[PDB]
Structures are given as structure tokens and as C-alpha cells.
Design a protein around this ligand. Structure first.
Ligand SMILES: CCCCCCCCCO[C@@H]1O[C@H](CO)[C@@H](O)[C@H](O)[C@H]1O
Ligand SMILES: CCCCCCCCCO[C@@H]1O[C@H](CO)[C@@H](O)[C@H](O)[C@H]1O
Ligand SMILES: CCCCCCCCCO[C@@H]1O[C@H](CO)[C@@H](O)[C@H](O)[C@H]1O
Ligand SMILES: CCCCCCCCCO[C@@H]1O[C@H](CO)[C@@H](O)[C@H](O)[C@H]1O
Ligand SMILES: CCCCCCCCCO[C@@H]1O[C@H](CO)[C@@H](O)[C@H](O)[C@H]1O
Ligand SMILES: CCCCCCCCCO[C@@H]1O[C@H](CO)[C@@H](O)[C@H](O)[C@H]1O
Ligand SMILES: CCCCCCCCCO[C@@H]1O[C@H](CO)[C@@H](O)[C@H](O)[C@H]1O
Ligand SMILES: CCCCCCCCCO[C@@H]1O[C@H](CO)[C@@H](O)[C@H](O)[C@H]1O
Ligand SMILES: CC(C)[C@H](N)C(=O)O
Ligand code: NA
Ligand code: NA
Length: 441
């Protein structure tokens, strides 16, 4: 006797809460900026349409049918089969992603603290770039704020699905978009819009010759949709029978893509107006936006709101990440929810400490050749486990299910979409993923 979404539309809300977070504004902005912009944008969008939405629906189908955890969904639906390797990577990918996800979310809480104590209202003596660099170089200051965020994440997973995950404030997410739209409009007036919008919407096709622009595009697409980290199989596993999955998948992926494109329209016109380079790294939004808030008379109020709402959004995504291992360890080892929540939460926190330290004292240490600890874990998680696990998931429903079962449990029977959906999982998605791995590696 396990959990289910109490309210009807609690599923689409929780799935949208998982998808929308730091990946849309933080990671989308610097991965776009260091990949040329528009050409990477057209590739990232095509991957969302032809691969992302089929696998989003695929993960919902596996979860609802099996009614188990990220790994248990494969033991039940296909006993004794090696398909379950897709679920182990997702649990592994959830661990790795949440370790450094909490670091970036700690930067959010630190910036929210400085606008609340009036510290960042005016520009600091060293500039917003120098001020940000001083903070992420500090060894222990970020570990405090990352631990604070993890406590909030541990608290909400421990409370439960019905009492915590489903009980999130549902007005915070529309408010973030309303604030992103208004910051998009304002930044369009800052004078770098012609250069910023050509960067984002006028393609330089030369980038299409680098096999790294596809892997980066497929990493960002899986990352931003919470694909391949066992998150959508778990949330699907709390879903009842009379649930229309296809529209939920299109609604999850469509709303998520709107946030990224509005985040891009906000950031890159602001990047060029400030004279900076769009290849500014993970601190891109963390250096651009405090400068933008300073050019507004009521910017301090804008900054408090922007970091509360984004902070609320990062919290709901991190809650969906920790629930994947939490759900797994409850079944495998009979741990209670609170037991698994604090145990795996404290652990994942300590795994993120080396990632946090790589922006400062550990800045020189490299794991993967050419990449520090943070870039190494992000590469192993985003660029290997998510597309591979995402590829095994597609092959799983494509060649491991009776067609009638797939279309039935997906609510796509006798549909032109159901024929194109099977086409995606059987051929297009696993073929294109394998091609991107081969060219890039
Ligand atoms: C028990 C409640 C405690 C809540 C936390 C209060 C944080 C107060 C921080 O204020 C800051 O302190 C600095 C010196 O300490 C000043 O230089 C700075 O100008 C000021 O903005
Ligand atoms: C619960 C909140 C915890 C906040 C902890 C912040 C730790 C910052 C310590 O300051 C550091 O002290 C050194 C002297 O030892 C200086 O040389 C160094 O310049 C300075 O960066
Ligand atoms: C409900 C959460 C409240 C907890 C507040 C924790 C305060 C952390 C204080 O650290 C200090 O913050 C200063 C900013 O003013 C920095 O200048 C300084 O380097 C750093 O040592
Ligand atoms: C980093 C450590 C911080 C983690 C905080 C975890 C708080 C867990 C609270 O959970 C709930 O507390 C109630 C107490 O009455 C129980 O009745 C209920 O069953 C339980 O679900
Ligand atoms: C709900 C949507 C809110 C959109 C907010 C857009 C605010 C943009 C204001 O820009 C400023 O406007 C002045 C004239 O209006 C100019 O003199 C000034 O140079 C310009 O920088
Ligand atoms: C809020 C939505 C804004 C949509 C912006 C899409 C238009 C991007 C076009 O970029 C460039 O604009 C320059 C302006 O002259 C042209 O010279 C150049 O040829 C063109 O490539
Ligand atoms: C959010 C809605 C945005 C709509 C998409 C805007 C399309 C911008 C078209 O740029 C075009 O790129 C070409 C390079 O291939 C140039 O040849 C051409 O001169 C230039 O105009
Ligand atoms: C919920 C809305 C969040 C976005 C708000 C957009 C900021 C509007 C900025 O307008 C004006 O721009 C001028 C810049 O020159 C300032 O001098 C002026 O004082 C400021 O008020
Ligand atoms: C769960 C998290 C990775 C979410 N997909 C994001 O875009 O931030
Ligand atoms: Na996202
Ligand atoms: Na979220």
C-alpha cells in the first residue's frame, strides 16, 4: 500500500515543477552561450520535439504501468531482463546531478540573502563579476548555503508525496514566468538587442560541423526535461489509471521550452549591452542579472523576487531528484521515508562538496582530461548517463513491448501520434542518440 497523487492534476503540476528549475535559466544560458547560440538552439529544439517528448511519454508509461521506483519499474514489467540498467543509471544520474545542483541552488540562497540584507542593492567596489568570483572562491561560505538548501529538500521528501511534493505553492511558478517575461521586455530596451537577438536567432551554421554541439544539445534537452535521471518514472509511478499521459508530456515539455527561450531573450540582449562575452561560464546569469537589477530604480525589489521565485523553482526540481533514490532505497532496504530522506540527503550533500570546492581551492584539479571536478561530474551525469539511459528506455518500449501494450498504456491507441510515437522510440531516438555518441566520442 504505497502512495499516489491525491488531487487529479497534482501529477502534471509536480512533473512541470520537476522540469522547470535551474536548467532553464542557469544551465541553458551558458550552454547556449558557449555553443554559438542560434545553431545550437535549432538543434536543441529539434531534439526536444523528435526525441524529448517521446521519451518523456515513455518514462510516464513505464512508471504508471509498473507502479514502482525508478529501478523497480523494470524488474516488474520485464523480470530477469537487462533492461533495468536504464533505471540504475537514472538513480546514479540523480545522485550525481543533485550533488552539484545543490551547489548552484546555494548560490541562489546566498544572493537572496544579500538583497534581503541590502548588500547588493548598489554595485560592490569590485564589481558584480568580482563579487561573484569572491563568493564561489570562498571554501566554506557556499557549503553553508548548499547545506541549507539540502535541508529544505530533505524536509519535503521526508514529509511525503501527498503532504509535501504535491502541496507546493502553485502560484510561484506562474509568477516566475511573469517575472521572466517582464525582464525579457526590459532587457530588449537596454541597447544590445540587435546583437543579442542575432546571437540567439540568426544561425551561424559552421557550428553544425562540430560533433560537440549535438552532444551538448542532447545533454541540455535531457537535463532540462528531467529525462534519464529516473525522475519521471517515479512521478509517473504515483499516477492512477485514468490519467491522460500524452498531453501531460506535451504540456511538460512545452512549458519547459517556453521558460528557456524567454530566459534567453532576457539574458543575451543583457550580455551584449554590458559588453561581456556570452561564453562567461556557469556564472553567466549570476554576473549578468545583478548588473541588470542595478540599472533599475526598484531593482533591489526585483532581485528579492527573482531569487525567491527561482529559488522556489530550484527547490521543486531538487525535490524530484532526491525522491528517485528515496523511493528506491525504501523498497530495496525497507527504510522508512524519513530514514531514507535524511540518510541519502546528507550523503548527496557531501558528494557535492568537491564540486563546490572546484570553483575555488580545487580549481586546478581535473578528473576527466581538461575538466575540473564540477565539469567532470556534469559531463558523466548529463552527457553519458542521461542519453544512454534515455536510449535504453526508448529501445525498451520500442522492442521490448507488445505494440498494443505500449499504445494502450500510453493512451495513444488508434492515433496518428501513436504511430509516430512508436517510430520515435523504435528507430529515430535510439539511432540518433547512438550517432551523436559516436561522432562526439
Ligand atoms: C537571529 C536573526 C539573524 C538574521 C541574520 C542577520 C544578518 C545581518 C547581516 O547584516 C549585515 O551585517 C554586516 C556586518 O555583520 C554589515 O556589514 C552589513 O552591512 C549588514 O547588511
Ligand atoms: C554560518 C555562516 C558561516 C559563514 C562562514 C564564512 C567564513 C569566512 C571566513 O573569512 C575568512 O577568514 C580568514 C581568516 O582566517 C581571512 O583571511 C579570509 O580573508 C576570510 O575569507
Ligand atoms: C535563515 C538563514 C540565516 C543565516 C545567515 C547566515 C549569515 C552568513 C554570514 O557570512 C558572512 O556573510 C557576509 C555577507 O554580509 C559576508 O560578507 C561574509 O564573507 C560572510 O562571512
Ligand atoms: C538534515 C536533517 C533535517 C531533516 C528534517 C526531517 C523532519 C522529518 C519530519 O517528518 C515527519 O515528522 C513527524 C513528527 O511528528 C512524523 O510524525 C512524521 O511521520 C514524519 O514524516
Ligand atoms: C509588464 C511589462 C513591464 C516591462 C518593463 C519595461 C521597462 C523598460 C523601461 O526602459 C526605460 O524606459 C524609459 C522610457 O519609458 C526610457 O527613457 C529609458 O531609457 C528606458 O531604459
Ligand atoms: C522578441 C522576438 C524577437 C525575434 C528576433 C528574430 C530576428 C533575428 C534576426 O537577427 C538579425 O537581425 C539583424 C537586424 O538588422 C539583421 O540585419 C540580420 O540579418 C538578422 O540575422
Ligand atoms: C521567437 C521567434 C524568432 C523567429 C526566428 C527568427 C529567424 C531569424 C532569421 O535570421 C536569418 O538567418 C539567416 C542565416 O542563415 C540569414 O540568411 C538571414 O539574413 C537572417 O534574417
Ligand atoms: C514585475 C516587473 C519586473 C521588471 C521591471 C522592469 C524595470 C522597469 C525599469 O523602469 C525604469 O528604467 C529606468 C532605467 O533608466 C530607471 O531610471 C527607472 O527608475 C526605472 O523604473
Ligand atoms: C530536475 C532538474 C534537472 C530540472 N530538469 C531542471 O531543468 O533544472
Ligand atoms: Na528544465
Ligand atoms: Na522546479
Amino acid at each position: 500500500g504505497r502512495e499516489q497523487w491525491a488531487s487529479r492534476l497534482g501529477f502534471i503540476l509536480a512533473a512541470m515543477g520537476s522540469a522547470v528549475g535551474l536548467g532553464n535559466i542557469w544551465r541553458f544560458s551558458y550552454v547556449t552561450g558557449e555553443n554559438g547560440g542560434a545553431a545550437f538552439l535549432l538543434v536543441y529544439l529539434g531534439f526536444i520535439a523528435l526525441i524529448g517528448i517521446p521519451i518523456v511519454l515513455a518514462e510516464f508509461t513505464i512508471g504508471r504501468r509498473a507502479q514502482s521506483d525508478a529501478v523497480g519499474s523494470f524488474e516488474k514489467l520485464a523480470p530477469g531482463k537487462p533492461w533495468k540498467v536504464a533505471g540504475l543509471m537514472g538513480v546514479a544520474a540523480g545522485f550525481l546531478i543533485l550533488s552539484f545542483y545543490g551547489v548552484i541552488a546555494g548560490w541562489i540562497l546566498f544572493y537572496l540573502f544579500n538583497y534581503i540584507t541590502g548588500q547588493l542593492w548598489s554595485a560592490p567596489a569590485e564589481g558584480f563579476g568580482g563579487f561573484f568570483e569572491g563568493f564561489i572562491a570562498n571554501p566554506t561560505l557556499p557549503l553553508f548555503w548548499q547545506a541549507l538548501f539540502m535541508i529544505a529538500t530533505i524536509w519535503i521528501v521526508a514529509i511525503g508525496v501527498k503532504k509535501g511534493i504535491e502541496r507546493s505553492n502553485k502560484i510561484l511558478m506562474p509568477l516566475l514566468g511573469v517575472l521572466l517575461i517582464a525582464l525579457a521586455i526590459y532587457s530588449l530596451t537596454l541597447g544590445g538587442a540587435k546583437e543579442g537577438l542575432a546571437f540567439l536567432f540568426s544561425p551561424d551554421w559552421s557550428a553544425l560541423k562540430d560533433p560537440g554541439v549535438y552532444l551538448a544539445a542532447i545533454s541540455q534537452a535531457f537535463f532540462t526535461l528531467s529525462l534519464g535521471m529516473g525522475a519521471l518514472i517515479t512521478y509517473g509511478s504515483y499516477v492512477s489509471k485514468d490519467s491522460r499521459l500524452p498531453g501531460a508530456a506535451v504540456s511538460v515539455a512545452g512549458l519547459d521550452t517556453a521558460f528557456a527561450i524567454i530566459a534567453g531573450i532576457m539574458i543575451f540582449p543583457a550580455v551584449f549591452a554590458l559588453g561581456l562575452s556570452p561564453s562567461g561560464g556557469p556564472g553567466l546569469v549570476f554576473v549578468v542579472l545583478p548588473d541588470i537589477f542595478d540599472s533599475i530604480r526598484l531593482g533591489p525589489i526585483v532581485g528579492i523576487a527573482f531569487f525567491i521565485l527561482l529559488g522556489a523553482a530550484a527547490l521543486s526540481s531538487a525535490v524530484s531528484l532526491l525522491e528517485v533514490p528515496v523511493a528506491y532505497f525504501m523498497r530495496k532496504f525497507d527504510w522508512s521515508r524519513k530514514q531514507a530522506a535524511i540518510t541519502l540527503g546528507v550523503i548527496i550533500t557531501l558528494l557535492g562538496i568537491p564540486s563546490s570546492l572546484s570553483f575555488g581551492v580545487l580549481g586546478e584539479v581535473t578528473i576527466i582530461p581538461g575538466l575540473n571536478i564540477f565539469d567532470s561530474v556534469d559531463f558523466i551525469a548529463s552527457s553519458v548517463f542521461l542519453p544512454l539511459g534515455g536510449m535504453i528506455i526508448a529501445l525498451f518500449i520500442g522492442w521490448g513491448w507488445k505494440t498494443s501494450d505500449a499504445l494502450a498504456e500510453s493512451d495513444l491507441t488508434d492515433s496518428v501520434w501513436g504511430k509516430l510515437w512508436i517510430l520515435s522510440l523504435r528507430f529515430i531516438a535510439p539511432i540518433a542518440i547512438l550517432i551523436v555518441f559516436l561522432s562526439a566520442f
